[PDB]
Write a protein that binds this ligand. Structure first.
Ligand SMILES: CCOP(=O)(COc1ccc(C[C@H](NC(=O)O[C@H]2CO[C@H]3OCC[C@H]32)[C@H](O)CN(C[C@@H](C)CC)S(=O)(=O)c2ccc(OC)cc2)cc1)OCC
Lengths: 99, 99
């Protein structure tokens, strides 16, 4: 499909057997999701943006489904203000910018 | 053009007659550029990112050319980690997400 940018590019994702809303974010190197108690090991990490850095938990080889398109990669979990799907997963669903 | 996301979607912009590199950022509502000198009046404003809020200078109806495409809109200037082109200008140049 094609998504215009008049409004925030919000889509439904499936992760850890749960459905959530997330932003398709070409400005995000990595995927950052709201607090959720995913199973398995993780490693601490700090990511920075406008306003400074926050602490997140890095989970690897996590399966996410975005608009029916499956992807597997690293997901960062922490007190993020919004769920963002970053380039690490957007590439896997064949997402491009076009103008 | 069509831009893939294996690398950061960085493009050259022209603003205030000066060339700069900026990030096409579908997760940003607004356009935020690093500290620079622009002519005309400006109003102080606040914007919040992943790590909190920063103080910016809001310039309205500024001419900005993005990858050869002209736009005239609001540009925020402040301590952002990188120049980001937000949806307020991405819509003007006809940019969409596609997968
Ligand atoms: C406490 C305030 O509360 P808020 O709820 C905050 O909400 C939001 C917070 C963040 C975003 C997404 C970011 N957009 C953003 O900063 O946009 C600003 C300007 O335009 C406004 O629109 C939304 C916010 C304002 C951006 O797309 C991606 N980022 C990096 C960019 C900056 C290049 C370095 S990154 O997230 O930091 C990030 C860093 C490293 C990563 O992997 C290693 C992964 C992600 C969207 C909404 O209030 C405002 C809505």
């Amino acid at each position: 499909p094609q998504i215009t940018l008049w409004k925030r590019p919000l889509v439904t994702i499936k992760i850890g057997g749960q459905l959530k809303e997330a932003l398709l974010d070409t400005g995000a190197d990595d995927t950052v999701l709201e607090e959720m108690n995913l199973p398995g090991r993780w490693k601490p990490k700090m990511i920075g943006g406008i306003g400074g850095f926050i602490k997140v938990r890095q989970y690897d080889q996590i399966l996410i489904e975005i608009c029916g398109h499956k992807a597997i990669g690293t997901v960062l979990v922490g007190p993020t203000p919004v769920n963002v799907i970053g380039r690490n997963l957007l590439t896997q669903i064949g997402c491009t910018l076009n103008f």
